[PDB]
DNA sequence: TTTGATTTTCTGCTGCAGGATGAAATCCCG
DNA sequence: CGGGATTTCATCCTGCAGCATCCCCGA
RNA sequence: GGCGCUUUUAUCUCAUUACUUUGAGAGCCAUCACCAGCGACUAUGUCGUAUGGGUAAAGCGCUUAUUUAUCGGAGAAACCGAUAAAUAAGAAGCAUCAAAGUCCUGCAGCAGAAAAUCAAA
C-alpha cells in the first residue's frame, strides 16, 4: 500500500506534537466558485442529485466585473504615476523604497565611519555608514553596515552592504506610506483613482490597503533586480573590454582593416542597452565573416565578446500591446507590392542571356527538399516559371504578365475564402499561414530586382515587409487575454470580508465567501458563548494576534444589492485537507486562515474546443501545530541517481555498505534497485513532437496542447517524492542527493525546459517534508558527486584524463599490431568507432588499426612524441571514444577489469558509498594535509581509490 | 551541404524576487 | 454617546566545503 | 482522433461538494468532395490527395410496436413465440478501475517553429 496521506499520518502518530513558531507552514486551497454551468453538468448525472446547490446570484456578478475593472484601472494608474517619477529620477527613487531596520536596534553604536554612500530624500542630506560586529550561535562574525542621517527625524538604521562601493540590501513594500500620499483626502496629490476611477462607490480602508502592497511588491522587486544587475554589468564590461585587444591584436597580425567603433559606457536605460549590444553584435559578425572562416582560426584563440542580458523593465507599462488588425497589414502588403510592377518587369525582360541561370538559383530546390513531402511556395513559384519558360520560350516580356495574373488569382481565392469561413464563425489556421506565405513569395520575387540599384530604400522596404510578415504570422496565435485579481488582505473584521458557515451539532457544514467592499453595504458581527451553537445562523471564528480563537457570530441579508456573496465546489480530498481536517481544526484554532485573492482566468474546454473566463477562489492556510524530530534516527540510506533518461533510480544498503535485497523486481526475486519514472520521456517527446507538426502546419499550436506538459511533468515530479518518500518511511533510512548546482542542466539544441527537474524533485520533497514541521537535514542531505559515474564496483579504478596521456606514451606499433599496457595488464588495439556528427546524418564507421596505420603515415617509426599538435589531437580522440567506460548511456564497461553492468545503478550506489565516505576519517587526513596549499585534486582522487578498495577488501564482497 | 553569426515573430517552461495585516488612533455622527 | 469609518505603523531570526555531477557529435 | 460507464479513495474504526489533473479499465465509430492547401501534367485549368473548416458516426440486452425472408396455422394468410436484419421509443444495471493537487504579481533567460542577409566545407 502506497498512499502519501498514510505516511503523514504514520509520521503523526510515531511523534509528538508543539506548537508552530512565529510564522508556520503555508499551503494553498484552489476552488471554484459556484456557476450555472457547474450546476447544468451536475444535472445531467446518472444518478441525479437530491440537494442540488443554488447558483450564484446576477446581482453580485455585476459587482464583482466592475469591482475588478476598477481594481485593475487603479492600478494603472499608480504604476503610469510611478514609471514617470522613477523616469525623472532613479536615485531618488530607489532611496525612497529603502526598508529600515526593525525599532529595536538601539544597541550602542561603537564605530562610525573612519562615508556619503546614500542620503535620505526627506533632508537631502547624505547618510553616514556605521558599523556593528556580532557573534552567532556558530561563532562566525559578520559586520552589519547602517545609514543615519544627522537630523533626529531622520536618524534611522537604513541597512547597507559593502563591496570591494556599496548597495542598499533590502527593499520592502510597507516602507513608503502608500494610504497617507495616494487615498486619504488630506494629500494634494492629482492622482486620487478611488476618488477618480472609483466614481466615490468603495470603501477606502481595504481596496487601498490591498493596492498598497500590490504596487509596492512589483516596484520593490524591479529595484532589486536593476540593483543587483548594475554591478554584473560592469563586471562585463571590464572582462569584454581586455579581449577586444586581443582580437584586434589577432587581427592585426595579418594586416585586417577593422572598423573603428567604439563601446558606449554602461548604461542606466533601456536604450543604452540596446546600443552596447548593437555595437558588440556588429563586432562578432566582424569577426565571423573575417577571422574564422577565411583565416581557419579557431575560436578559443579569438573568444568572442560578451552582450549584456538579463536588463529588467518597469512593470506592466513598457510592455507594447502591438494592438493591430489582420486586415489592415493585409492591405499594407497589397498595397505596396502593387507599386512595384513596372521596375521588376523592366528587370526581368530586360536581363542577358546567362546571368538569368544565376539570377533563378533561389528558385531550385534540392532533390533532399523535394522529397520531403512538401516544398515552399518560392520553389513552386519557380517551378511554375520553369513550366512557362518551356511552354512559350525565351518570350521573358510576357511570363511576368502569366505570373502576376496566377498569383493574383491565388491570393483573390485565398482571400475570398478566408473570409468566408470567418464570417460566421469559423477559424482556419493553415489557410492564413498558406497566404501570408504566398504573399512573402510574390513580394520577393518582385523585390528581387531592386537589391543593388538602391539599397538604403531597398533595405527600409526590406524591414517593412519583415515586420509585416511577422505581424501577420504571429498574429492568429497571439493571446489578448490576461488575467483579473482580487486582494484581500486579511481575514478580520477591520477589512470586511467574511468567510462564514453554519453548524447543526456536527462539522457538517455549509460553506459561503461574503465580500462587503462597495459602500452601503451592510454585514455585522456578534460575539457569543463559544458554545451557544443556533440553527439556521451562520458562525465563523476570528483569530487573534495573541493567539485567542473567537467563536464570532455573523448576520446580513441575502438581498443587500451592495453585497457579493459566493457558494463554493470542490471534492472530498480538498475538504478533509483544509475544511473539516480531523487532526488540524480551524475551530480549535490548529489552522489559521491569513489571507486569499479572487481569480478570473482562462480555462479549455473539450465541449466547445475554446477557452473561457471562468472564476477561481484561492485561499491560504497557515498551520500553527508542528512535529518535533527530536526521536528520529535512520539507519538505511539509499542512494538517487537524477537524470533524464530515467527521472529516477534509487539503491538501498546497510550502513555497513552491503546491498540490501528487499525490493522485489518485475520478476518477483529479492534485489537493491529499482527505477521510478520511466517511460516518461517517450510521453514528453509524443507530446513536443505533435506541437512541431502543428506548429509546420499553420504556426502554432492549438490551445488543447498547451499545457499538458507542465501537467505531465508536475505528475511525474509529485508521484516520484511520494514513492521516494513511502520508500523512506516504510524501510527506516535516509535519502541521499547528489550536491548540485541550482539550476543545473544541459543547454544544447535538442534540450526543451520540462525534463530539467532535478532541482523541482528535491525542492517538493523538501516541501512536503516541512509542512509537518521537519528540518530538511533530518530526512534529506546531499553529499558529493565527484567521481561517482567513473568509479568500478568490482575493481573500483575511476578512470582520468591523466591515464589517458600516460597510456597513450605507451602505445607503439609490433607485429601483432599497435598495443599499450596499464599497470602491468596488456591492451589490444582492435575496434571500431560509432557516433554522429549531424550534417550528412548517416550511420558511419571507422577502423582503428587502419586509421592509426593511416597516422603513421605521416610519421617514421611511429614516434607519437614527435607529432603536432593538430594530428596528435586526433590521436586521444580517437582511443578515448573506443577506450570510453560510457559508450552508451545505459550501458558501462570498465577498462582495468572490463566490467559491463547498467550504468545508473552503479553510479546510485557509488553516491550512498561517497555518502558514507564523507563522513569517515580518512576524509579528515586528507583535509590535514591539504592545509598547506596542495590544491592538488589527484590526492584527493588517490585518497578516494585508497579507501574505495580499502573497505571493497573485506565488507564489500564483489558480486559473482 | 548544412553551418555559424545577425534580424523578425509567435509560443511554453523554468529561475529569480515579493509576500500570504492586525493593532492602535482619531474622527466622526446621526 | 457606541459603532462605524478612515488613518498610521511596524515586525524575531544567522546552510557549514570540493571541482562533475545525465550526456550523447562524419563520408 | 473521438463516443455513452464512472469508481477507488488516499479518515474503518467513521462520514458531506460536484473542483483541477494523471493513466495503465471493456465495447463502438472515424465516412463526404461542399470550400481551401497540395503533387503530376494534356496547364489562366484537369485528376488524385480527405492535409485543414464544415457536415453522419459512435454500448449490451430485453419491452413495445412496424418492415424483409424463415421455423411457426400444414400456409408461406393478419397476429405475433422464435429465427436473422433494419426502423422508432422509454425505464433498465451499465459493460470502469487506480493515484495526486502552494498560490498569485512582475521580470529575465532558454528551447520549439518558419522567413531574411555573408563565406567556407
Redesign the pocket.
Known sequence: ?????????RLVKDSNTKKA???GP???????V?TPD?RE??E????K?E???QPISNTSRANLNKLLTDYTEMKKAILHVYWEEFQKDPVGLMSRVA??????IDQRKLIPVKSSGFACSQCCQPLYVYKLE?????G???T?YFGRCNVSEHERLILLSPHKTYSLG??????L?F??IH????SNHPVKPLEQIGGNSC???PV???L???C???V???L??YQ?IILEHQKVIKKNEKRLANLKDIASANGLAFPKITLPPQPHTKEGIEAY??VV?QI??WV??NLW??L?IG?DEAK?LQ?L????????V??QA?EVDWWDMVCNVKKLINEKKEDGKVFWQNLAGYKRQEALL?YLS?E???KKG???????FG??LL?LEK?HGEDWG?VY??AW??ID??VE??S???K??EER???????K??LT??L?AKA?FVIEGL?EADKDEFCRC??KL??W???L???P???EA??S?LDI????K???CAFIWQKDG??????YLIINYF?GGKL??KKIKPEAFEANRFYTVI????GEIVPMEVNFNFDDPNLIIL???????????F????LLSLETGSL?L??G?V?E?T??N??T?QDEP?L?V?L?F?RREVLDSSNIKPMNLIGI???????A?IALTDPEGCPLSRFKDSLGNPTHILRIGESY?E?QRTI?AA??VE??????????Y??????????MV??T??DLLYYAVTQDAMLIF?????????????????E?????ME?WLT??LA?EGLPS?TYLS?T???????TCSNCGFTITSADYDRVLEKLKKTATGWMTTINGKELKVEGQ?????????????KDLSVELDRLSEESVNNDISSWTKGRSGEAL?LLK?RFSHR?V?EKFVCLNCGFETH??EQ?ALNIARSWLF?RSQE?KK??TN?TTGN?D?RA??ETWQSFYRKKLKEVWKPAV
Do not use: C
Not at 542580458?309 to 506592466?316: D, E, N, Q, V
Not at 506548429?695 to 488543447?704: E, F, L, M, V
Not at 558529493?784 to 567513473?790: G, I, V
Open positions: 500500500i502506497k498512499r502519501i496521506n498514510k505516511i503523514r499520518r513558531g512565529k510564522t503555508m499551503k494553498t486551497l484552489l476552488v471554484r459556484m457547474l453538468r451536475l445531467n448525472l446518472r444518478k442529485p440537494n442540488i446547490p526598508q529600515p531596520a526593525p525599532k529595536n556580532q557573534v552567532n550561535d556558530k562566525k562574525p559578520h552589519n533590502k527593499f520592502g513594500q510597507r516602507a506610506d494610504y497617507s487615498v486619504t483626502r488630506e470603501a477606502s480602508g487601498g490597503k490591498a498598497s502592497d500590490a509596492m511588491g512589483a520593490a522587486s524591479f532589486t533586480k543587483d549590444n548593437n553584435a562578432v559578425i565571423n565573416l572562416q577565411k581557419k575560436r568572442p552582450r542580458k538579463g536588463f529588467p523593465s518597469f512593470p506592466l513598457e510592455r502591438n533561389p534540392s533532399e527538399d523535394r512538401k516544398k515552399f511556395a518560392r520553389y513552386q517551378d511554375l513550366h511552354k510576357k504578365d502569366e495574373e496566377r488569382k491565388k481565392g485565398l475570398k475564402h478566408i468566408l469561413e464563425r469559423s477559424e482556419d489556421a493553415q489557410s499561414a498558406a506565405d504566398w512573402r520577393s537589391k526590406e524591414l519583415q515586420k510578415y511577422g505581424d504570422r504571429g498574429k496565435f497571439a493571446i490576461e488575467n485579481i488582505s486579511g481575514f478580520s477591520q477589512y470586511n456536527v462539522k457538517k457544514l455549509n460553506l459602500k455585522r458581527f483569530n487573534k494576534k495573541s457558494p463554493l465546489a470542490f471534492g472530498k480530498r480538498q475538504g478533509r485537507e475544511i473539516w481536517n480531523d489559521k491569513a489571507n485573492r481569480i482566468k480555462l479549455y473539450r465541449r474546443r471562468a477561481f484561492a491560504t497557515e541517481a537524477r537524470g533524464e533518461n530515467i527521472p533510480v520521456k510521453k513536443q506541437k512541431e506548429q509546420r502546419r499553420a504556426g502554432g499550436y492549438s490551445r488543447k498547451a499545457s499538458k506538459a507542465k501537467n505531465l511533468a508536475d505528475d509529485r508521484n517524492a511520494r547528489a550536491n548540485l548546482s541550482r539550476g543545473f542542466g544541459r543547454q544544447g539544441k535538442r534540450t526543451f525546459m520540462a530539467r527537474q532535478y532541482t523541482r525542492d516541501a512536503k509542512y537535514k546531499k558529493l558527486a565527484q567521481y561517482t559515474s567513473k568507432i560509432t557516433y554522429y556528427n549531424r550534417y550528412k546524418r548517416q550511420n558511419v564507421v580522440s571514444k559508450p548511456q550504468a545508473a553510479a564523507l576524509y586528507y583535509q591539504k590544491t585534486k584527493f582522487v
